[PDB]
Design a protein around this motif. Sequence first.
Motif, PDB file in Angstrom:
ATOM      1  N   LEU A  49      85.675  59.827  91.841  1.00 14.86           N
ATOM      2  CA  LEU A  49      84.245  59.621  91.650  1.00 14.86           C
ATOM      3  C   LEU A  49      83.786  60.128  90.291  1.00 14.86           C
ATOM      4  CD1 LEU A  49      81.562  58.709  92.691  1.00 14.86           C
ATOM      5  CD2 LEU A  49      81.491  60.594  94.292  1.00 14.86           C
ATOM      6  N   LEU A  50      84.530  61.063  89.704  1.00 11.86           N
ATOM      7  CA  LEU A  50      83.946  61.925  88.688  1.00 11.86           C
ATOM      8  C   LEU A  50      84.054  61.329  87.292  1.00 11.86           C
ATOM      9  CD1 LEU A  50      84.540  64.040  91.181  1.00 11.86           C
ATOM     10  CD2 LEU A  50      84.385  65.656  89.305  1.00 11.86           C
TER      11      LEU A  50
ATOM     12  N   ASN B  22      91.025  80.868  72.552  1.00 12.39           N
ATOM     13  CA  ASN B  22      91.888  81.794  73.259  1.00 12.39           C
ATOM     14  C   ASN B  22      92.212  82.926  72.302  1.00 12.39           C
ATOM     15  OD1 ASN B  22      93.482  82.899  75.262  1.00 12.39           O
ATOM     16  ND2 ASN B  22      95.288  81.686  74.712  1.00 12.39           N
TER      17      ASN B  22
ATOM     18  N   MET C  33      75.852  60.874  84.740  1.00 13.50           N
ATOM     19  CA  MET C  33      74.419  61.090  84.894  1.00 13.50           C
ATOM     20  C   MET C  33      73.983  62.396  84.244  1.00 13.50           C
ATOM     21  SD  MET C  33      72.441  58.807  86.445  1.00 13.50           S
ATOM     22  CE  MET C  33      72.684  57.211  87.217  1.00 13.50           C
ATOM     23  N   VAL C  34      74.893  63.368  84.148  1.00 11.69           N
ATOM     24  CA  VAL C  34      74.517  64.685  83.620  1.00 11.69           C
ATOM     25  C   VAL C  34      74.222  64.752  82.122  1.00 11.69           C
ATOM     26  CG1 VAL C  34      75.367  65.970  85.569  1.00 11.69           C
ATOM     27  CG2 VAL C  34      76.949  65.359  83.815  1.00 11.69           C
TER      28      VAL C  34
ATOM     29  N   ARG D 257      97.220  88.831  73.697  1.00  7.76           N
ATOM     30  CA  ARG D 257      96.381  89.603  74.596  1.00  7.76           C
ATOM     31  C   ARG D 257      97.172  90.790  75.123  1.00  7.76           C
ATOM     32  NH1 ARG D 257      91.890  86.198  77.450  1.00  7.76           N
ATOM     33  NH2 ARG D 257      92.586  85.096  75.567  1.00  7.76           N
TER      34      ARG D 257
ATOM     35  N   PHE E  60      80.574  59.948  88.163  1.00  6.96           N
ATOM     36  CA  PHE E  60      79.620  60.927  88.671  1.00  6.96           C
ATOM     37  C   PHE E  60      79.018  61.746  87.538  1.00  6.96           C
ATOM     38  CE2 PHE E  60      79.574  65.543  89.526  1.00  6.96           C
ATOM     39  CZ  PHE E  60      78.344  65.611  90.146  1.00  6.96           C
TER      40      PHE E  60
ATOM     41  N   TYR F 145      77.871  94.939  75.677  1.00  8.20           N
ATOM     42  CA  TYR F 145      78.818  94.862  76.775  1.00  8.20           C
ATOM     43  C   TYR F 145      78.776  96.163  77.555  1.00  8.20           C
ATOM     44  CZ  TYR F 145      82.842  93.615  79.503  1.00  8.20           C
ATOM     45  OH  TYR F 145      83.676  93.288  80.546  1.00  8.20           O
ATOM     46  N   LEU F 146      78.476  96.054  78.854  1.00 10.93           N
ATOM     47  CA  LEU F 146      78.511  97.160  79.815  1.00 10.93           C
ATOM     48  C   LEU F 146      77.588  98.303  79.408  1.00 10.93           C
ATOM     49  CD1 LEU F 146      82.313  97.237  80.574  1.00 10.93           C
ATOM     50  CD2 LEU F 146      80.541  95.831  81.594  1.00 10.93           C
TER      51      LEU F 146
END
Lengths: 50, 98, 319, 290
Positions: free
Chosen positions: D224-225, D268, D231-232, D272, D228, D170-171
């Motif tokens: 649509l989804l 999660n 197909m993926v 935090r 839609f 990281y970084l």
Amino acid sequence: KIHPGVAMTVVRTDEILSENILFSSRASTSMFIGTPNVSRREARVDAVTF
Amino acid sequence: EYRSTVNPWASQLGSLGDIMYNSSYRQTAVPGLYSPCRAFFNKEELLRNNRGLYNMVNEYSQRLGGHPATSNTEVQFVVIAGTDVFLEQPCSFLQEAF
Amino acid sequence: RRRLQRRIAGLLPPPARRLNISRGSEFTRDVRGLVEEHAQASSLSAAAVWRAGLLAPGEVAVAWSGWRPPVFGDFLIHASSFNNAEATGTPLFQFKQSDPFSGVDAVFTPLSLFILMNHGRGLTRMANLLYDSPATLADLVPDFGRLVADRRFHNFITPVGPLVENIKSTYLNKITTVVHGPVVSKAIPRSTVKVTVPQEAFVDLDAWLSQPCPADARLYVALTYEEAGPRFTFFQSSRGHCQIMNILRIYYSPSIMHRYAVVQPLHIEELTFGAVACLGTFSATDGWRRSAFNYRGSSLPVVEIDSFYSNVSDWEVIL
Amino acid sequence: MDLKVVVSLLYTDEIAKMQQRIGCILPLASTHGTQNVQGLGLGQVYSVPDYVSMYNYLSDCTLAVLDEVSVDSLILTKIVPGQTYAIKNKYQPFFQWHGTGSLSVMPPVFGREHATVKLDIVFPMVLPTPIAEEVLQKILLFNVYSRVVMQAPGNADMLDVHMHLGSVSYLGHHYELALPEVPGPLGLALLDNLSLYFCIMVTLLPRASMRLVRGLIRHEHHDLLNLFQEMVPDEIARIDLDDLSVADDLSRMRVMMTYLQSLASLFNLGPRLATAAYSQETLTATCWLR
């Protein structure tokens, strides 16, 4: 150690730690001094930060 | 006045001395090294003194000279701090070298 | 046990939640003791310090009330990477630099964040008028094309909240920003500060739909990934985070199939349609009064959210 | 407001090893004035290790950065979401922090002997969020890749799983990890059941996906989804079984739903902390609960 077809000019720079002399005439500027102002800017539980 | 240049590999616009040195100087360059000859080649800096004389003397002193080098380090890095460094350099004022 | 009564007398009485006034014309000392809030700045004398009560522990008390003092994020940036003609209340974005030790960070206004998206391909006139060269910004992100390409630009930029203090240094600028808490300016005449987001990047979401009116209407910033380069939009909503990802998926419903139709996601990392993040809350009534931001040459429309409580959050991906 | 919690109980080596950690945090058992020794951090949960109950104990009970350690008392301050605090990164897996990065608290995965003080006290790991999700992925897939080569050594090679899981990045900070090279089968390790959760939800996700997509397509067109994104995926996992016991399929869907929700709350990263001004000169960080 033979000469190439070209010649080169090195260019450098140098730091000269001088000691300068500031002169300034009498009553050049007129400065306006404000009254100081304190303010708390960070107040966590262990140490406030003024 | 008896010749145009003393070298045609650096004095021209598309010459080698403009190719390998004169790009626009950025503080946030990823190499970030300082090349000392960049003060003679920067097209912006070569016409940064196109302003009048007193308005050049004000800006030479009011702010730090263009293309300066960091002191107190091993290798001469270009300036990024600008906090505690203070130096007058004529090299960005008269555009010659000794 | 008699000193205990003195300690509890020093500890008991909260500020008065109710006060029986008779007339407003008299202006009694009791209602003045109600309405007065202790300050945060005073002159540098013993009388002014003791009168403002700065030295009281935790919270101010002359010699807890639902108010939280803000915290300030201190950032060092290059003077070229920022424009000193910016407004005070503008939300910035620190980019996590990839070096182990930096010293100098890298922040972005959404005007400056626009020209990272523009090059390689009104608002844009003012953006190119403020910052002349994008290449002095496009090296702060060292590998912008790869990071946009593998859709990892949201986790490397974290929001930081609006700006409050910007000293006009010559090489390395230090700006102060409120990462959390009540956004209020640190000026000796204490003047208010309005969070300014440019208008074309700030599309409302309450009026985009067009009865229970809540108080805290949050402000969501939204990075999306487009075929025309990524975009940084801003959304105001009066709803929950659970509501905001559903309605933002519905809002971006043409754009996802647009990016899918022009480019097939041939790998596995191109599926993420960016992310959103709550920038904090403000009042839903007098929110988002429209104003203008004038440079020397031009002027663009800009929203002015007033009395913002900045509270950033982590990135919630949109898909 | 008052915030101190004075826990009563040391000697010179204990004085030293506690004075090294005067800026770290530990959870408590109560938000009260005086506490016993047992109510301190992670003593009753880490002595057989298991990540899910340790995360439940870390998110359930409160948290407290300690301030001072006497010969017999530990004056410590609990952290409340009201005001702000100051913490230090004085932990044996040393990760360099940064400014305005979210800080997480995970139960100690890099060995009990690294993050402890033997008088007991066990401090949880404090380390920033992208490194947290990175090392969580890299210990999960390490457990899976070690268990498959303890099952069948021809599936993967031990050196091939070690060039990408024996280090995080990281970084530019290219850290390293302490991985248990001998975990021992049938569980009995740390992260021994979370991988056992991950595999069950990965297994039951196609059986959920076919039933869910076929269940919604007769709901003709809300968007649509629903059709839609048919197909993926691959067509192999699309037409898999489509005939199963409805009670058994119901139990499989419910089990994968609860194992999905618990794993989703666990991924999660937990309680935090949101830092503001880290300074590597003083090793301090102004943070607050978020």
